[PDB]
Structure formats: structure tokens, C-alpha cells
């Protein structure tokens, strides 16, 4: 439906695919269709084995994603609200589980599902003028896209609570100071400084073992949600997966022959 565009970058960006929300008419809000195309796209990248890094961004300057579409919501019966929100929550959770490194490039507004979707990404970067927050309580509801879970895990319980309790919106610098994002940027002429940084950062990921990068992501993600000892067991099992791989050997041979490894993800 054009609102979502999945691009597979070429040349020096080979290995990086991009997901760009494009829906100005609705401030990139999460409409019933946008999460289907989104869900559709995500399920596809799951299996896509040639991908090495996924960037999520907006093609509408000044806006990343305003969250759920309040308009469509007012037309939903109480017995329909829950199911729809849960759908939002699940598509975002699917994003948090994408096989490869993920980067959310915030160049504009990002509220509710907008920020929540970015919270599902591994790393977040934003212009200093970008605005983001979870303002659900002001509407007598709560973040329904995992924000009640990922925000506290990302910036700490106390700060996440203050933000949700006050439904306060932060700008790039504030977000960076609280830890919400790793890199804060200075918006440029075309309003894509964040996306730009994301591209650069992603390139730093391309030269590594595709198989290593994935199990490493698994070890980190799964292990953080269980006791450390079990977490250690998970690392061992992820590491085991890198042993019978060619890249493991192509890497040891790359340094012998003093040259950039030619990993294949094998």
C-alpha cells in the first residue's frame, strides 16, 4: 500500500535493508493496514538470510511514528480495542526478535507505538530536535506496545516510571541523557541526520560473521531474561553454533594471510 517501503541497499550498504514508514496523511500512525504490511514485511525478513542489519525509519521529515491511530480507535468497540492493541504489541515483539542487528533512526516525532517500535530495535539514534515519549496515561490508558516492559529495561525503573507517570515527552538531548538513545545527532538540511548515522553505524556491522552476529544477538536477548547461570548455558549453546562454521576458519585464516575476511555466513 506504499505506506511501508522495504529497500535492500546496494554497493557499500549491501547487507543492510531499510524499512521506511511513509504515511504523512496519518503522521505515520499505526493504522490497521500499516501493521499488516509491517507484520508482513517483518515475517519476511525473519527468513531472509542475506540481510545483515535492519534500519527502521520514516520517509516523512519531522515524524517517525505518532503511535496508534486515535481516529480509527474511536470507532472500535470495547471488545475490539484489546485485540487490536495486542496485535500492535505482537508485531513490535516480532521486531525485537528479528535475527540481525536492528537500528531505529528517529528524525521526528515518536510516541506510543512509535517509540515502542523503536524500543524493540537493538539501538536507537535521533536528531536533537526529535520528540518522543509515552503519553498513554494522559488518555487514561497505558503503553500497550511493550513500553511498560522495554522502557524500564532500557532507562531503568525509576526514570521509566517518571516518564510514564507524567506522560512527559523528551527531545533528542534529553533522551540521550536518560539513556533512551545511544547517539544524538544534529538534524541536517534534509531532516535525516539520524537515518544517516544509522546507515554509518550499520556499515560497522557488515564486516562481521553473519552467523556469529545472530547467535550473539540470541545469547544477549534470551540471557538477559533468565538467571545468569542459565544465561551462561545459553551463551555456550550459541557459541557452539559458531564452531562448525567456515567463517570461524575463514577468520583465523584471514589474519594469517593478513587480509579482510570474506565471511559468507557459512
Known catalytic residues are 68, 113, 116, 136
Q: Which of residues 149-178 bind its own copies (CB under 8 A)?
A: 149-154, 156-162, 164-168
In this structure, what C-alpha cell is assigned to residue 90? 505482537
CB of 211 to its own copies, least distance (A): 6
Q: How far apart are CA 214 and CA 99, in angstroms?
A: 6
Size of the site for its own copies (CB under 8 A): 101
Report yes or no: 115 and 228 within 8 Å, Cβ to Cβ: no
Report yes or no: 64 and 58 within 8 Å, Cβ to Cβ: yes
CB of 130 to its own copies, least distance (A): 17
Q: How far apart are CA 59 and CA 50, in angstroms?
A: 24
Q: Which of residues 67-96 bind its own copies (CB under 8 A)?
A: 70, 73-74, 78-79, 81-83, 85-86, 89, 93
Q: Which of residues 192-251 bind its own copies (CB under 8 A)?
A: 201, 204-205, 207-209, 211-213, 215-245, 247-248, 250-251
Q: Which of residues 133-152 bind its own copies (CB under 8 A)?
A: 136-144, 146-152
Is 258 one of the binding residues for its own copies (CB under 8 A)?
Answer: no
CA-wise closest residue to 241 among 213, 220, 221, 262: 213
Q: How far apart are CA 181 and CA 126, in angstroms?
A: 7
Q: Which of residues 103-132 bind its own copies (CB under 8 A)?
A: 122-124
Report yes or no: 42 and 94 within 8 Å, Cβ to Cβ: yes
Q: How far apart are CA 206 and CA 55, in angstroms?
A: 13
CB of 189 to its own copies, least distance (A): 27
Using CB under 8 A, pick the residue from 2, 10, 25, 47 that binds its own copies: 47
Amino acid at each position: 500500500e506504499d505506506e511501508l517501503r522495504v529497500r535492500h541497499l546496494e554497493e557499500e550498504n549491501r547487507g543492510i535493508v531499510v524499512l521506511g514508514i511513509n504515511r504523512a496523511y496519518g503522521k505515520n500512525s499505526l493504522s490497521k493496514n500499516l501493521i499488516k504490511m509491517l507484520s508482513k514485511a517483518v515475517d519476511a525478513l525473519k527468513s531472509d538470510k542475506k540481510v545483515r542489519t535492519i534500519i527502521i525509519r520514516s520517509e516523512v521529515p519531522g515524524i517517525f511514528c505518532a503511535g496508534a491511530d486515535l481516529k480509527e480507535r474511536a470507532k472500535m468497540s470495547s471488545s475490539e480495542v484489546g485485540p487490536f492493541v495486542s496485535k500492535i504489541r505482537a508485531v513490535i515483539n516480532d521486531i525485537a526478535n528479528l535475527p540481525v542487528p536492528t537500528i531505529a533512526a528517529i528524525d521526528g516525532l515518536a510516541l506510543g507505538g512509535g517509540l515502542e517500535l523503536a524500543l524493540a530495535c537493538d539501538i536507537r539514534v535521533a536528531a536533537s530536535s526529535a520528540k518522543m515519549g509515552l503519553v498513554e496515561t494522559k488518555l487514561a490508558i497505558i503503553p500497550g506496545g511493550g513500553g511498560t516492559q522495554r522502557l524500564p529495561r532500557a532507562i531503568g525503573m525509576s526514570l521509566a516510571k517518571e516518564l510514564i507517570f507524567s506522560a512527559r515527552v523528551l527531545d533528542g538531548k534529553e533522551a540521550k541523557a536518560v539513556g533512551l538513545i545511544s547517539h544524538v545527532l544534529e538534524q541536517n538540511q534534509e531532516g535525516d541526520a539520524a537515518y544517516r548515522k544509522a546507515l554509518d553505524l550499520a556499515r560497522e556491522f557488515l564486516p562481521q560473521g553473519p552467523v556469529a552476529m545472530r547467535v550473539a544477538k540470541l545469547a544477549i536477548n534470551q540471557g538477559m531474561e533468565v538467571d545468569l547461570v542459565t544465561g551462561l548455558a545459553i551463551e555456550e549453546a550459541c557459541y557452539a553454533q559458531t564452531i562448525p562454521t567456515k567463517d570461524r576458519l575463514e577468520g583465523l585464516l584471514a589474519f594469517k594471510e593478513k587480509r579482510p575476511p570474506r565471511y559468507k555466513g557459512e
